[PDB]
Short mmCIF file of C-alpha atoms and ligand atoms in Angstrom, two decimals:
data_model
loop_
_atom_site.label_atom_id
_atom_site.label_comp_id
_atom_site.label_asym_id
_atom_site.label_seq_id
_atom_site.Cartn_x
_atom_site.Cartn_y
_atom_site.Cartn_z
CA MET Q 1 0.00 0.00 0.00
CA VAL Q 2 2.69 2.41 0.94
CA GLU Q 3 6.41 2.69 0.45
CA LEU Q 4 9.38 4.28 2.02
CA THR Q 5 12.70 4.89 0.32
CA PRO Q 6 15.74 3.44 2.12
CA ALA Q 7 16.67 7.06 2.64
CA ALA Q 8 13.49 7.75 4.73
CA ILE Q 9 13.91 4.59 6.83
CA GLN Q 10 17.23 5.80 8.04
CA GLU Q 11 16.27 9.27 8.83
CA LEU Q 12 13.74 7.14 10.77
CA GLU Q 13 16.60 5.84 12.92
CA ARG Q 14 15.84 8.95 14.55
CA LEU Q 15 14.57 6.93 17.29
CA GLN Q 16 16.91 9.45 18.99
CA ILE Q 27 6.64 1.13 13.52
CA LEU Q 28 5.24 4.29 11.70
CA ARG Q 29 1.85 5.83 11.51
CA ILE Q 30 0.74 7.86 8.68
CA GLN Q 31 -2.57 9.82 8.88
CA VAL Q 32 -3.79 13.27 7.64
CA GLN Q 33 -5.07 16.34 9.16
CA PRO Q 34 -6.90 19.31 7.74
CA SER Q 35 -4.45 21.99 6.74
CA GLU Q 36 -4.19 25.61 5.61
CA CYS Q 37 -2.11 24.93 2.50
CA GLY Q 38 -4.25 22.53 0.47
CA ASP Q 39 -6.70 20.30 2.18
CA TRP Q 40 -4.74 17.68 4.05
CA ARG Q 41 -1.34 17.71 5.64
CA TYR Q 42 0.40 14.37 6.42
CA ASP Q 43 0.70 13.67 10.10
CA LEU Q 44 3.59 11.34 11.06
CA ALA Q 45 4.12 9.63 14.30
CA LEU Q 46 6.46 7.01 15.68
CA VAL Q 47 4.28 4.66 17.66
CA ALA Q 48 4.42 1.71 20.12
CA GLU Q 49 1.31 0.20 18.51
CA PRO Q 50 -0.96 0.55 15.43
CA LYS Q 51 -4.61 1.45 16.00
CA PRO Q 52 -6.26 -1.92 15.73
CA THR Q 53 -7.93 -0.94 12.38
CA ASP Q 54 -4.85 0.57 10.61
CA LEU Q 55 -3.69 -0.77 7.23
CA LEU Q 56 -0.22 -2.24 7.75
CA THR Q 57 2.69 -2.78 5.43
CA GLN Q 58 6.08 -4.33 6.01
CA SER Q 59 9.01 -2.88 3.92
CA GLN Q 60 12.64 -2.98 5.13
CA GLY Q 61 11.60 -4.62 8.44
CA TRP Q 62 9.44 -1.58 9.46
CA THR Q 63 5.72 -1.66 9.98
CA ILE Q 64 3.71 1.11 8.36
CA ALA Q 65 0.35 2.00 9.84
CA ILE Q 66 -2.04 3.72 7.48
CA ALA Q 67 -5.17 5.01 9.16
CA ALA Q 68 -8.23 3.34 7.76
CA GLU Q 69 -10.33 6.46 7.36
CA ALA Q 70 -7.48 7.85 5.15
CA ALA Q 71 -6.83 4.74 3.09
CA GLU Q 72 -8.58 6.46 0.17
CA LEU Q 73 -6.38 9.47 0.52
CA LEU Q 74 -3.14 7.43 0.93
CA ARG Q 75 -3.29 4.10 -1.03
CA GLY Q 76 -0.16 4.05 -3.06
CA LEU Q 77 1.80 6.60 -1.07
CA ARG Q 78 5.59 7.08 -1.32
CA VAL Q 79 7.71 8.55 1.41
CA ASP Q 80 11.19 9.81 1.11
CA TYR Q 81 13.52 11.88 3.07
CA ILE Q 82 15.55 14.57 1.35
CA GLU Q 83 17.80 17.33 2.62
CA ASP Q 84 17.58 19.91 -0.08
CA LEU Q 85 18.05 23.62 -0.22
CA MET Q 86 15.01 24.19 1.93
CA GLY Q 87 16.37 21.84 4.55
CA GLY Q 88 15.63 18.29 5.58
CA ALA Q 89 12.10 16.95 5.56
CA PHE Q 90 10.02 13.99 4.62
CA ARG Q 91 8.68 14.11 1.07
CA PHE Q 92 5.59 12.66 -0.49
CA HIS Q 93 4.53 11.24 -3.73
CA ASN Q 94 0.84 10.57 -3.33
CA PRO Q 95 -0.79 9.26 -6.42
CA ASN Q 96 -4.11 10.42 -5.09
CA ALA Q 97 -3.05 14.06 -4.78
CA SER Q 98 -4.61 16.13 -7.36
CA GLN Q 99 -2.62 19.17 -6.05
CA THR Q 100 0.24 19.39 -3.52
CA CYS Q 101 1.29 22.65 -1.85
CA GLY Q 102 4.79 24.00 -2.75
CA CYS Q 103 6.52 21.87 -0.03
CA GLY Q 104 4.73 18.64 -0.71
CA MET Q 105 3.36 18.18 2.77
CA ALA Q 106 -0.15 19.35 1.95
CA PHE Q 107 -2.47 18.15 -0.79
CA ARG Q 108 -6.05 17.87 -2.07
CA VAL Q 109 -7.61 15.15 -4.07
CA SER Q 110 -10.21 15.60 -6.75
CA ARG Q 111 -13.76 16.41 -5.68
CA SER Q 112 -16.37 13.61 -5.36
CA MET B 1 -18.90 9.39 22.23
CA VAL B 2 -21.53 10.74 19.84
CA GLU B 3 -24.36 12.93 21.12
CA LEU B 4 -27.68 13.49 19.34
CA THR B 5 -29.66 16.43 20.64
CA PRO B 6 -33.27 15.68 20.97
CA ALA B 7 -34.14 17.73 17.94
CA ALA B 8 -31.84 15.42 15.97
CA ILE B 9 -33.77 12.49 17.38
CA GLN B 10 -37.20 13.70 16.20
CA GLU B 11 -35.80 14.23 12.83
CA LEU B 12 -34.40 10.82 12.81
CA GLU B 13 -37.70 9.56 14.08
CA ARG B 14 -39.44 11.56 11.42
CA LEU B 15 -37.20 9.81 8.91
CA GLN B 16 -37.60 6.07 9.63
CA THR B 17 -40.98 6.05 7.92
CA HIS B 18 -41.44 8.41 4.99
CA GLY B 19 -43.08 6.25 2.20
CA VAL B 20 -43.15 2.82 3.98
CA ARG B 21 -39.60 2.94 5.18
CA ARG B 22 -39.57 -0.17 7.36
CA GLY B 23 -41.70 -0.76 10.44
CA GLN B 24 -38.56 -2.71 11.53
CA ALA B 25 -35.29 -2.24 13.63
CA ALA B 26 -33.33 0.97 12.75
CA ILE B 27 -29.85 1.87 13.90
CA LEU B 28 -28.14 5.12 13.24
CA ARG B 29 -24.89 4.19 11.50
CA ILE B 30 -22.22 6.84 11.18
CA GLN B 31 -19.26 6.35 8.95
CA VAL B 32 -17.09 8.91 7.52
CA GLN B 33 -15.40 9.85 4.35
CA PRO B 34 -12.77 12.25 3.32
CA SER B 35 -14.24 15.34 1.88
CA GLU B 36 -13.45 19.08 2.03
CA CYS B 37 -15.26 22.25 3.23
CA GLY B 38 -15.28 25.98 3.40
CA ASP B 39 -12.89 27.03 6.10
CA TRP B 40 -11.57 30.33 7.29
CA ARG B 41 -7.87 30.81 6.79
CA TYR B 42 -6.12 32.95 9.50
CA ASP B 43 -3.92 35.84 8.53
CA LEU B 44 -1.64 36.46 11.44
CA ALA B 45 0.50 39.69 11.06
CA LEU B 46 2.67 41.78 13.32
CA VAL B 47 1.61 45.36 12.89
CA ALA B 48 2.78 48.40 14.79
CA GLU B 49 -0.86 49.33 15.50
CA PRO B 50 -4.39 48.02 15.70
CA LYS B 51 -7.04 49.47 13.39
CA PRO B 52 -9.22 51.99 15.37
CA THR B 53 -11.79 49.19 15.35
CA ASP B 54 -10.19 45.83 16.23
CA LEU B 55 -10.94 43.84 19.34
CA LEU B 56 -8.04 43.66 21.59
CA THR B 57 -7.34 40.82 23.89
CA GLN B 58 -4.32 39.88 25.83
CA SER B 59 -2.51 36.57 25.88
CA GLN B 60 0.96 35.86 27.12
CA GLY B 61 1.35 39.62 27.64
CA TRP B 62 1.21 40.05 23.85
CA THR B 63 -1.66 42.14 22.64
CA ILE B 64 -3.89 40.46 19.98
CA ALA B 65 -6.08 42.43 17.64
CA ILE B 66 -8.90 41.04 15.62
CA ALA B 67 -10.85 42.62 12.82
CA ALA B 68 -14.19 43.91 14.22
CA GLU B 69 -15.89 41.78 11.68
CA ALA B 70 -14.07 38.44 12.15
CA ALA B 71 -15.02 38.77 15.83
CA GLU B 72 -17.41 35.81 15.91
CA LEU B 73 -15.20 33.52 13.93
CA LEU B 74 -12.24 34.29 16.05
CA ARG B 75 -13.10 34.20 19.79
CA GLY B 76 -12.45 30.55 20.52
CA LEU B 77 -9.30 30.37 18.37
CA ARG B 78 -6.37 28.82 20.11
CA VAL B 79 -3.01 29.07 18.23
CA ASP B 80 -0.43 26.46 19.15
CA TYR B 81 2.83 25.40 17.50
CA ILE B 82 4.22 21.93 17.39
CA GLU B 83 7.34 20.39 16.12
CA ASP B 84 7.08 16.75 15.07
CA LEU B 85 8.48 14.50 12.32
CA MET B 86 6.88 16.77 9.66
CA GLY B 87 8.53 19.78 11.20
CA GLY B 88 7.28 22.87 12.81
CA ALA B 89 3.89 24.34 12.21
CA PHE B 90 1.39 26.55 13.75
CA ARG B 91 -1.78 24.73 14.79
CA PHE B 92 -5.06 26.47 14.70
CA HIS B 93 -7.87 25.28 17.04
CA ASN B 94 -11.33 27.00 16.91
CA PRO B 95 -14.48 25.41 18.13
CA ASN B 96 -16.85 27.73 16.14
CA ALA B 97 -15.10 26.82 12.80
CA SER B 98 -15.84 23.22 13.93
CA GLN B 99 -19.52 23.71 13.05
CA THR B 100 -20.43 21.93 9.86
CA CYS B 101 -23.88 22.11 8.26
CA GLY B 102 -25.53 18.89 7.11
CA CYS B 103 -26.99 18.02 3.77
CA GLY B 104 -30.35 19.62 3.06
CA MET B 105 -31.78 16.91 0.67
CA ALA B 106 -34.19 15.55 3.33
CA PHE B 107 -35.89 19.00 3.28
CA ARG B 108 -35.89 19.61 -0.52
CA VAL B 109 -38.17 18.63 -3.69
CA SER B 110 -37.68 20.34 -7.20
CA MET F 1 -10.76 35.13 23.12
CA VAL F 2 -7.82 34.34 21.05
CA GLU F 3 -5.44 32.21 22.94
CA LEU F 4 -1.79 31.53 22.14
CA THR F 5 -0.04 28.64 23.89
CA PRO F 6 3.48 29.19 25.37
CA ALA F 7 4.97 27.07 22.61
CA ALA F 8 3.51 29.58 20.12
CA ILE F 9 4.62 32.63 21.94
CA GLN F 10 8.17 31.41 21.71
CA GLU F 11 7.92 30.70 18.08
CA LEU F 12 6.60 34.24 17.57
CA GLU F 13 9.05 35.89 19.93
CA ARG F 14 11.67 34.08 17.83
CA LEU F 15 10.43 35.46 14.52
CA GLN F 16 9.88 38.98 15.76
CA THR F 17 13.59 39.35 16.65
CA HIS F 18 14.69 38.42 13.05
CA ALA F 25 5.61 47.06 20.13
CA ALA F 26 4.56 43.36 19.60
CA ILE F 27 0.94 43.60 18.25
CA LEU F 28 -0.32 40.44 16.64
CA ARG F 29 -3.27 41.10 14.25
CA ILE F 30 -5.56 38.41 12.88
CA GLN F 31 -7.98 38.47 10.02
CA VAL F 32 -9.71 35.71 8.10
CA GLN F 33 -10.21 34.98 4.44
CA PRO F 34 -12.53 32.31 3.01
CA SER F 35 -10.63 29.12 2.26
CA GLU F 36 -11.04 25.32 2.10
CA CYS F 37 -9.63 22.48 3.99
CA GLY F 38 -10.06 18.79 4.29
CA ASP F 39 -13.02 17.60 6.21
CA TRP F 40 -14.61 14.26 7.19
CA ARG F 41 -18.08 13.98 5.67
CA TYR F 42 -20.41 12.20 8.12
CA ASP F 43 -22.54 9.57 6.31
CA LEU F 44 -25.64 8.93 8.43
CA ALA F 45 -27.81 5.93 7.48
CA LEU F 46 -30.55 3.99 9.28
CA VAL F 47 -29.89 0.31 8.97
CA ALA F 48 -31.31 -2.92 10.25
CA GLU F 49 -28.23 -4.31 11.85
CA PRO F 50 -24.68 -2.80 12.32
CA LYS F 51 -21.63 -4.35 10.69
CA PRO F 52 -20.22 -6.92 13.03
CA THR F 53 -17.03 -4.83 13.43
CA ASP F 54 -18.68 -1.57 14.49
CA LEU F 55 -18.62 0.09 17.80
CA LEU F 56 -22.07 0.33 19.41
CA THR F 57 -23.13 3.33 21.53
CA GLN F 58 -26.15 5.27 22.48
CA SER F 59 -27.73 8.61 22.70
CA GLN F 60 -31.06 8.90 24.29
CA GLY F 61 -32.27 5.49 23.44
CA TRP F 62 -31.07 5.49 19.82
CA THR F 63 -28.73 2.78 18.87
CA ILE F 64 -25.70 4.27 17.01
CA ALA F 65 -23.31 2.02 15.19
CA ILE F 66 -19.92 3.52 14.37
CA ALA F 67 -17.56 2.20 11.70
CA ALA F 68 -14.52 0.75 13.59
CA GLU F 69 -11.96 3.34 12.11
CA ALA F 70 -14.25 6.27 12.45
CA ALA F 71 -14.24 5.86 16.21
CA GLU F 72 -11.31 7.98 17.21
CA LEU F 73 -12.58 10.75 14.96
CA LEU F 74 -16.21 10.51 15.99
CA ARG F 75 -15.59 10.52 19.68
CA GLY F 76 -17.38 13.68 21.05
CA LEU F 77 -19.25 14.35 17.78
CA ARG F 78 -22.46 16.13 18.71
CA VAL F 79 -25.27 16.00 16.14
CA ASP F 80 -27.85 18.71 16.30
CA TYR F 81 -30.64 19.53 13.96
CA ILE F 82 -32.08 22.89 13.00
CA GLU F 83 -34.77 24.43 10.91
CA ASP F 84 -33.99 27.88 9.71
CA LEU F 85 -35.21 29.91 6.84
CA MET F 86 -33.35 27.58 4.61
CA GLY F 87 -35.20 24.65 6.14
CA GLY F 88 -33.98 21.74 8.15
CA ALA F 89 -30.60 20.08 8.29
CA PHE F 90 -28.41 18.42 10.80
CA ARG F 91 -25.63 20.46 12.30
CA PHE F 92 -22.43 18.51 13.15
CA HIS F 93 -19.98 19.89 15.77
CA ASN F 94 -16.91 17.79 16.30
CA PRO F 95 -14.39 19.17 18.74
CA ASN F 96 -11.69 16.72 17.55
CA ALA F 97 -11.80 17.81 13.97
CA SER F 98 -11.83 21.60 14.73
CA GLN F 99 -8.10 21.55 14.06
CA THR F 100 -6.16 22.81 11.20
CA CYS F 101 -2.43 22.53 10.70
CA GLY F 102 -0.61 25.77 9.54
CA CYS F 103 2.07 26.02 6.86
CA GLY F 104 5.41 24.28 7.47
CA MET F 105 7.33 26.91 5.50
CA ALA F 106 9.06 30.18 6.13
CA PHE F 107 11.14 32.65 4.26
CA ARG F 108 14.80 31.72 4.76
CA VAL F 109 15.64 35.44 5.28
CA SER F 110 12.74 36.88 7.16
CA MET E 1 -24.42 43.14 -5.22
CA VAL E 2 -27.26 40.83 -4.15
CA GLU E 3 -30.71 40.72 -5.57
CA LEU E 4 -34.10 39.60 -4.38
CA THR E 5 -36.92 38.56 -6.62
CA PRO E 6 -40.29 39.88 -5.57
CA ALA E 7 -41.19 36.21 -5.12
CA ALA E 8 -38.43 36.03 -2.38
CA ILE E 9 -39.64 39.46 -0.97
CA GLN E 10 -43.20 38.22 -0.75
CA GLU E 11 -42.17 35.16 1.11
CA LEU E 12 -40.02 37.25 3.36
CA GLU E 13 -42.83 39.49 4.47
CA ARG E 14 -44.90 36.34 5.03
CA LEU E 15 -42.53 35.01 7.68
CA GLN E 16 -42.05 38.53 9.11
CA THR E 17 -45.50 37.53 10.39
CA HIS E 18 -47.10 34.14 11.35
CA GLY E 19 -43.66 33.26 12.70
CA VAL E 20 -43.39 36.60 14.60
CA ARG E 21 -39.82 35.75 15.46
CA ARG E 22 -39.11 38.98 13.51
CA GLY E 23 -36.62 41.41 15.08
CA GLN E 24 -39.55 43.24 13.42
CA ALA E 25 -37.36 45.02 10.83
CA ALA E 26 -37.31 44.25 7.16
CA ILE E 27 -33.72 42.94 7.58
CA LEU E 28 -32.41 39.81 5.96
CA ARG E 29 -28.99 38.82 6.93
CA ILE E 30 -27.04 36.54 4.68
CA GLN E 31 -23.85 34.72 5.59
CA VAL E 32 -22.30 31.26 4.84
CA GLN E 33 -21.40 28.29 6.99
CA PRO E 34 -19.08 25.37 6.18
CA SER E 35 -21.08 22.62 4.52
CA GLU E 36 -21.06 18.87 4.20
CA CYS E 37 -22.31 19.41 0.64
CA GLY E 38 -19.84 21.45 -1.24
CA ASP E 39 -18.10 24.01 0.76
CA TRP E 40 -20.44 26.61 2.08
CA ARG E 41 -24.14 26.53 2.94
CA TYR E 42 -25.98 29.79 2.75
CA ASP E 43 -27.42 30.99 5.95
CA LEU E 44 -30.35 33.28 6.11
CA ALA E 45 -31.76 34.99 9.12
CA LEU E 46 -34.26 37.76 9.72
CA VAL E 47 -32.59 39.95 12.29
CA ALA E 48 -33.43 43.03 14.27
CA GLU E 49 -30.54 45.04 12.99
CA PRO E 50 -27.41 44.11 11.21
CA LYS E 51 -23.92 43.85 12.73
CA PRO E 52 -22.31 47.34 12.31
CA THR E 53 -19.75 45.81 9.94
CA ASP E 54 -22.11 44.11 7.39
CA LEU E 55 -22.61 45.20 3.82
CA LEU E 56 -25.98 46.70 3.34
CA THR E 57 -28.10 46.56 0.18
CA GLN E 58 -31.56 48.13 -0.08
CA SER E 59 -34.17 46.37 -2.20
CA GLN E 60 -37.95 46.77 -2.44
CA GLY E 61 -38.32 48.26 1.06
CA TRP E 62 -36.04 45.56 2.48
CA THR E 63 -32.64 45.78 3.99
CA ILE E 64 -30.23 43.11 2.97
CA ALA E 65 -27.20 42.50 5.11
CA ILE E 66 -24.24 40.48 3.87
CA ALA E 67 -21.67 39.32 6.46
CA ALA E 68 -18.42 41.11 5.52
CA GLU E 69 -16.15 38.09 5.56
CA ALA E 70 -18.38 36.43 3.06
CA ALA E 71 -18.59 39.40 0.70
CA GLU E 72 -16.23 37.58 -1.68
CA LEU E 73 -18.35 34.48 -1.62
CA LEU E 74 -21.67 36.32 -2.15
CA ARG E 75 -21.09 39.43 -4.30
CA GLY E 76 -23.94 39.44 -6.89
CA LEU E 77 -25.94 36.60 -5.40
CA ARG E 78 -29.51 36.59 -6.52
CA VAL E 79 -31.99 34.90 -4.29
CA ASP E 80 -35.35 33.66 -5.56
CA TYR E 81 -38.14 31.80 -3.84
CA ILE E 82 -39.90 28.85 -5.58
CA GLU E 83 -43.08 27.13 -4.33
CA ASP E 84 -42.86 23.34 -4.05
CA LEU E 85 -44.61 20.46 -2.32
CA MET E 86 -42.58 21.22 0.74
CA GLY E 87 -43.99 24.81 1.07
CA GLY E 88 -41.32 26.47 -0.97
CA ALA E 89 -37.60 27.07 -0.80
CA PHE E 90 -35.17 29.86 -1.51
CA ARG E 91 -33.01 29.43 -4.57
CA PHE E 92 -29.67 30.98 -5.05
CA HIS E 93 -27.83 31.93 -8.09
CA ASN E 94 -24.31 32.75 -7.11
CA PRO E 95 -21.89 34.05 -9.76
CA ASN E 96 -19.13 32.92 -7.38
CA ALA E 97 -20.32 29.37 -7.30
CA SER E 98 -18.25 26.84 -9.19
CA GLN E 99 -20.58 23.95 -8.49
CA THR E 100 -23.75 23.82 -6.55
CA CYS E 101 -25.04 20.74 -4.64
CA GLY E 102 -28.01 18.63 -5.69
CA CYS E 103 -30.59 20.52 -3.46
CA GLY E 104 -29.20 24.02 -4.09
CA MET E 105 -28.54 25.01 -0.47
CA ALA E 106 -24.84 24.51 -0.79
CA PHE E 107 -22.09 25.54 -3.21
CA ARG E 108 -18.31 25.04 -3.81
CA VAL E 109 -15.94 27.80 -5.01
CA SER E 110 -13.00 27.50 -7.38
CA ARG E 111 -9.75 25.96 -6.01
S1 FES H 1 -26.87 20.28 0.94
FE1 FES H 1 -26.69 18.24 0.45
S2 FES H 1 -27.21 18.38 -1.61
FE2 FES H 1 -27.76 20.33 -1.09
S1 FES H 2 2.39 23.25 3.95
FE1 FES H 2 2.42 25.17 3.23
S2 FES H 2 3.63 24.93 1.46
FE2 FES H 2 3.44 22.92 2.15
NA1 NA H 3 -6.70 24.96 3.40
NA1 NA H 4 -18.06 19.40 2.52
#
């Protein structure tokens, strides 16, 4: 359902399982919300991929099926990056999107 | 959990018939789906002055001015700021913006 | 009134050093929202969460539960007629922009 | 900005009686509210006076008050009233509207 680039994984050792959900946002409609968690909500959609579990929130499946997550330090600094095939628009930074109206 | 005011109940109750809509068991089932809605975006600015017309409150010893006319939308706004994995962002909480209005199809025939 | 947490004061105090009057205005915009699908149904799905308000059975989709917690459903007739009003304290929460000018 | 058909006027004076929740002034206050259908639902109230900050329009011996933050969403709205089997309903034709829901109460604006 969802992938992470090896690059993201390792920024994820950074622990000084991952849970992707969305929240309403000013730029766009939805901004990704990322947490490191002890346990997936029981109804999350899980994927293995480089021995990590990825917890997609079920209500957001529609908004996230197919998602790609990468870490890049570029000229704006270091941040997770997102290639969401469901995004019909992403803000400038990539962390906010909107999908097409139903 | 969920509350249904009693006005929401009569309407429900009004709805289980209409036509011959089942003299049988009837549970209210709520599920959800991603959608979008009108929203008010906040323009925070640091002026030298208020307009001779803003409403001035006080929080953290900073004065806050609000446009006379956004008054109702704005009392209730709580501005926070969190840094997480996605970085650092202001967080806007407002219970009045929380009000969404439901579909009107139940009321309408053209 | 408008309330600014300590975490937010510090992030503003930060910026301002790069009289303190913060001014707020709104402009019409859009954001993402959860649409509540109400239905009346015979039985719930076997995975739903069952609750109750005033003697109505309410089945909630398993995933919707976190988000629906504290949802209040009112109903009003105005000049436009009747419709449910939904007020969800959870979802009254919008995340601001992650970006800033590099020289501000 | 903002027009009422006599049909809408007629219905407005009707409710400004027989539902003598009036404010007892020929004042109609229009604003919007976030909507499950589309983006914004219109919201109409008869009020006693308008908020000092609203945008006034005078039609047909009626004061029409548009909430200032919604100016942009409502400029040039025309409001009609159509009888139906429910007793009637206001209709809105909003030059700002990019889609309108099935029942007309709600509209989206352009992205
Ligand atoms: S508000 Fe639901 S279709 Fe008109
Ligand atoms: S969140 Fe504002 S540009 Fe991406
Ligand atoms: Na937005
Ligand atoms: Na909506």
